Design a protein around this nucleic acid. Structure first.
Ligand SMILES: [Cl-]
Ligand SMILES: [Cl-]
Ligand SMILES: [Zn+2]
Ligand SMILES: [Zn+2]
Lengths: 239, 238
DNA sequence: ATGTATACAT
DNA sequence: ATGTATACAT
């Protein structure tokens, strides 16, 4: 983005996501302007856009604060993504999907199968993460509803709430590596349930799929607390 | 009390009535002149209305009034039901404080007094005011700020609100007679939460959102052009 | 049409 | 510390 407003959005987003501007920190207009070497006006533009994005909260009485996320908020965000993905999957099973959209999502699932070797640790991380992003974008749009697609993507927009969040390409942790086989079995079950018009199953399996991220998070809290801050998308967690 | 704040209220009203139709570009100078204020509180208002979901930011700059069709009304009601079902399920699974259960149960008891001896005999205004309280209490019941925030966001579009197709907005026989069933569901939601029955709490709270969808479907079928005259539906493009 | 800096107000 | 109007820039 070639504008001061636009640059400030990019610069502040990066500082917030990395934990450099921590959750709970008040972002004063004059202080933020001086930090970025611009005036208060492009700063207000940037603060408004970052509030719309959900990285900042507006304070009663004026001003902006970096929205604070503790482990309970991450757990709730992952729960919400799961519920929304479960809705996208159920509505595709209930309302029906076009022949081409089913073929495309089924093709992604078959390609995801090739990321797995003969050993339980033998997984192509980068290949998996790129295809996993595609699968979840396809799932969000599958029932053809613009509103559902929009709400599913919004529920997946916080870095820790993304279907890409706790994957071994972000952080090469044994637990994240070994969680991929199970997650892939769920991708297959989601597509088969949608083809079979099994809305209750499609919802339940897509919702359970989001529990991979929560299980991986719980493993880290218990097994390597300080490593959390070193995992991308988790540096901003206040706890 | 601010120009920014007043402009949010004034523009929201103009959007909800269809005065500023879906697809209309809201220029900074044009909107400033319309509200008799400068561009600065206008940009503040346009940002807040984008967060609310009544406007979209355009890729090359500017704001446009978000277009809503009938498919959007059905989808928004579906999403509110799913979110309310989640708030209900998490309260049942995690548990609720003694005071929060007492407060929501008090609202339900107050809602019982809106009903008479005849099936049509219902206090519409009393019901709608208490219904808003119940749904705000349900959203906050499990004590999670994130859930509360997301449930409220899913209930913010006029046609997606738990108040949307009630007889105080539009006195239609079907809307009147749907209230007894909806009240039995409020009682079932609270009892399922007290009993830690998360699957029941979710199912009952989700079904409770189907009252609005059933009432909408009734109007489309039985009185199609009367829909516009229903508040919160005047902005629907279809 | 919007971006940007700033004076002036509470 | 920010709400607000406005001149001037892009
Ligand atoms: Cl939409
Ligand atoms: Cl200051
Ligand atoms: Zn996945
Ligand atoms: Zn209700």
């Amino acid at each position: 983005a070639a504008t001061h407003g636009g640059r400030a959005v990019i610069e502040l987003r990066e500082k917030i996501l990395s934990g450099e501007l921590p959750g709970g920190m008040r972002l004063f207009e004059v202080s933020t302007a001086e930090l970025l070497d611009i005036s208060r006006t492009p700063v207000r533009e940037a603060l408004s856009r970052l509030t719309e994005e959900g990285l900042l909260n507006r304070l009663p009485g004026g001003g902006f604060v970096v929205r604070r996320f503790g482990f309970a908020d991450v757990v709730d965000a992952i729960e919400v993504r799961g519920v929304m993905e479960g809705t996208a999957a159920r509505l595709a099973a209930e309302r029906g999907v076009s022949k081409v959209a089913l073929e495309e999502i089924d093709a992604t699932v078959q390609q995801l199968d090739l990321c797995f070797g003969d050993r339980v640790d033998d997984v192509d991380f980068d290949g998996y993460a790129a295809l996993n992003r595609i699968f979840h974008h396809q799932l969000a749009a599958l029932c053809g509803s613009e509103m559902i697609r929009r709400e599913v993507e919004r529920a997946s927009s916080l870095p820790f709430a993304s279907p890409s969040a706790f994957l071994p390409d972000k952080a090469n942790i044994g637990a994240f590596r070994r969680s991929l086989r199970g997650a892939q079995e769920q991708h297959k079950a989601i597509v088969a349930a949608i083809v079979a018009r099994e809305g209750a199953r499609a919802e339940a399996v897509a919702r359970e799929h989001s529990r991979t991220a929560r299980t991986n998070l719980e493993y880290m809290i218990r097994e390597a607390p300080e490593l959390i801050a070193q995992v991308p998308g988790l540096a901003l967690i206040s706890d």
